[PDB]
Amino acid sequence: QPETLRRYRPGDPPLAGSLLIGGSGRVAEPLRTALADDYNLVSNNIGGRWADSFGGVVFDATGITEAEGLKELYTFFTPLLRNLAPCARVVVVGTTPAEAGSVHAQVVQRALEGFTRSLGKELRRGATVSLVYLSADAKPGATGLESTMRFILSAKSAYVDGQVFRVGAADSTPPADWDKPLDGKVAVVTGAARGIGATIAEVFARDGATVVAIDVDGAAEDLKRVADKVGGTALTLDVTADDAVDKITAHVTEHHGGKVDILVNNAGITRDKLLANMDEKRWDAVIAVNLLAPQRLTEGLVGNGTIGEGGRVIGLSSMAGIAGNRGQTNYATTKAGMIGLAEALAPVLADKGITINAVAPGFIETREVGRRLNSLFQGGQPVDVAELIAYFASPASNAVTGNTIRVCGQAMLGA
């Protein structure tokens, strides 16, 4: 039966249970130091005794350099698995494979993904698995991966499962309050009148952001209701219009101190048709809204300084973007394009202190096959998507860029 997944409410501790950190790499110790105040840490012991079930288990694999060393995955995990709490979080931390140094080390660091993806398909009771790579050039403190670990090791990551997080080398500063990580940040969310966009606005406001909710004139009434509820502002506009950048800039200047800290390119349309039956308007409309507009809003707002130091851009990709979908050559192109925008702009935007990432939702309740064909045996909720976006949006997520991460419950579907 599907598990009722633990999700986040304000003030919640990160885990329902303890956090065991082990492995003999470069991350275990500094991670213990970073997380000690906020998590109830326990250690491995040969007696196999722990008062509580584990809410999280983290294995530091960054020290493994030879295939024989992979046996520690077995020796470490096999005795721990029976003590996992429902919705526990299992995480392996490795070194970015291309940065692992030796050929043999790169092989084993790459091999870790076969292990984690498999373990995701074995965990019980809503528990999830994650793989996090950390650059070999990260400082001993490993502060750059803290926001990633705190997202994974919480209820917020409920529907993120089987995935790979790639942290670079930069140092990070915690937010003033990890429970209100977006305090003071101004967040523009397109397509925010309803659906996932409205939930993104809600989660962002929960986390302390001031939300600029954007949608089309035609959705003005719904948009106003969202903006009012979340304590933000409503901005009606067509993201494809030449003056969209100007209008956003004017709006944040009038209401929000002249800055956009977080841009979520969530607006999107479909004009589904088999390519054999495609026409010009159905092709162009989809490319205009879903690819040209996010490219223009991102480049235009960076280009006039509205998005600057500390900026966070998150694009919505999709399963069609990764795996393709019948009748969606237009839509899938745009959603693969949103991955391309993150991959291409990441190095360019780095120089200005801006990150850009992509989120690909799976099956989200907004049919029975889409719903059950994932490790969690259920569809996701809009909040689950919003949480992953809020993770990338964190001021403490400056060392995370050019990533595409799915929020899919470890769906079977992929590439």
Place this chain on the structure above:
Amino acid sequence: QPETLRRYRPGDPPLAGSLLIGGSGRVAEPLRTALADDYNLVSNNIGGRWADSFGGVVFDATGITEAEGLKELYTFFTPLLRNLAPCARVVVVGTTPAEAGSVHAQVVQRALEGFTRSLGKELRRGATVSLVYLSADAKPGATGLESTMRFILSAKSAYVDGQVFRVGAADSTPPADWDKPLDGKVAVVTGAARGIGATIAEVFARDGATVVAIDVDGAAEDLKRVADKVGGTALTLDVTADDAVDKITAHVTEHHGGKVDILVNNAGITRDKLLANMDEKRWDAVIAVNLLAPQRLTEGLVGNGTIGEGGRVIGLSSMAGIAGNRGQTNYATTKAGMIGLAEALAPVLADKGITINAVAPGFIETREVGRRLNSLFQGGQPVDVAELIAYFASPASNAVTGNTIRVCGQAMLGA
């Protein structure tokens, strides 16, 4: 209903139908020049008139640099799709996205994968789709992609669908005979007594190779029958043994002129167990056969010069390696490791004129859900796997390295 897929027999022309090449990039013209003798080329025309159905359609997208330019995918393909033959081949050729130059060009070159993967899910009557990227540093002749195009544009690629081929910058020479591309080459195939390994031996011999069929002492009778049939030799050994490299070297010295041109690391075992129920022997046995042995055979045979200039190493990955599988934390680790071996060794082996790639089969007939959940609505055949391996093995495939390609009929399952 599933299509009866066209497959290759000796002497067959590459396509059942014509080959239309279009698009206004750097590949269309030199590709026409290269393929003119062996393919019946036709061109696009505004009248929409062609005597024959298309056996292949190639679109050169290497010139597309802006999202507006993606509309040419629509304008080019939509009028052609109704003239495809059964089992036709549709190919888009782009520029390696990171090499595309501008941010906008990288975005659109990356976006091409959403288009191709989607079109694969629309094509009828066993037709397939492929995306090929060519390095921006390839010479105008584009000879480095010829073997890739000839593999795709043939019956050999029957069960390869939805995939991405990445060609670097090197120039290539055709084999003396494209119909016997492995003539004179010595190919070692592990796990060759039965199953896919025996079919790899058969296909290699068909293509002109002299096969060294390797399997365990216990499979000696079956191994001898394969070696006799294919005109090769049988070498019984345990690939995990310290002297495996020595024994292979001695064998090829005695029978095959002292060289191994092609190494196929196909031998593999499973010891399926949930990680919670894992034990040391089930972990170690799988790592030894499936990861340590291919690493050692490859590094040892390169290291004593048995594999040298012109060498081709192909590892067998698997769906478990890419997507994970319940009960296979050990096996999946090794199969992800086989991808790692290709990724890690590619740059090191480049200096010695050796390529290394990985093949990940899907559902191959050797159950009904695995069988039908792909674009071709059927399981694959061992020959289909062998054909993809033989493509990487081609002497003309020197510009293809560090690739992992699935042979899965565009299976739903992935990452």
